[PDB]
Copies of this chain bind each other. A is one copy, B any other.
């Protein structure tokens, strides 16, 4: 048996920090990554300018739009915490990470074989052209572990959402 000792507002956050470092993308794609990523529990979205990313910046205006999307998706998903969407930085400026995951076509390691649900999370995804093998080395040097997303080619948007889902939705959090 038991007894309702005290009602409370439901836990909506994932528990640990989840920073998604995503390469700038063509079209409007990024807006969509931000929204869905907000629903999937990301806490920080850090756009990256990389070797093959077409865009290399982002006006103050484009960034404000991405922030309204995050806020709007936050309310829809039932979250109180609004993920911080930041100004794009260089891939070299990627900080050292306690635990990081990078989607790479070559790896064999699955996310469930690598993930420690107790520590913070750093996730990296490349642009439509992908990361340059020197960028993945840089990433591995930062602490990001290369992980597989299957035997099919995924749009960058999907890879980011898929990678994130296996870390949040997949762990039931």
Given A150-B40, A152-B12, A155-B39, A165:B161 Cβ within 8 A: yes
A154 part of interface (Cβ distance < 8 Å): yes
Contact-residue bracket for chain A: 35 or more
Whether A148 is near chain B, meaning CB under 8 Å from some CB there, is yes
From 64 to 80 in chain A, residues with beta carbon under 8 angstroms from any chain B beta carbon are 76-79
A78 to B152, Cβ gap below 8 A?
Answer: yes
Query: Which residues does chain B contribute within 8 Å of A153, judged by CB atoms?
Result: 39, 76-78
Which residue of the partner chain, among B41, B150, B155, contacts A152 with CB atoms under 8 Å?
B41
Q: Which residues of A contact B (CB under 8 A)?
A: 10-14, 36, 39-41, 76-79, 108-112, 148-155, 158, 161-163, 165-166, 168-173
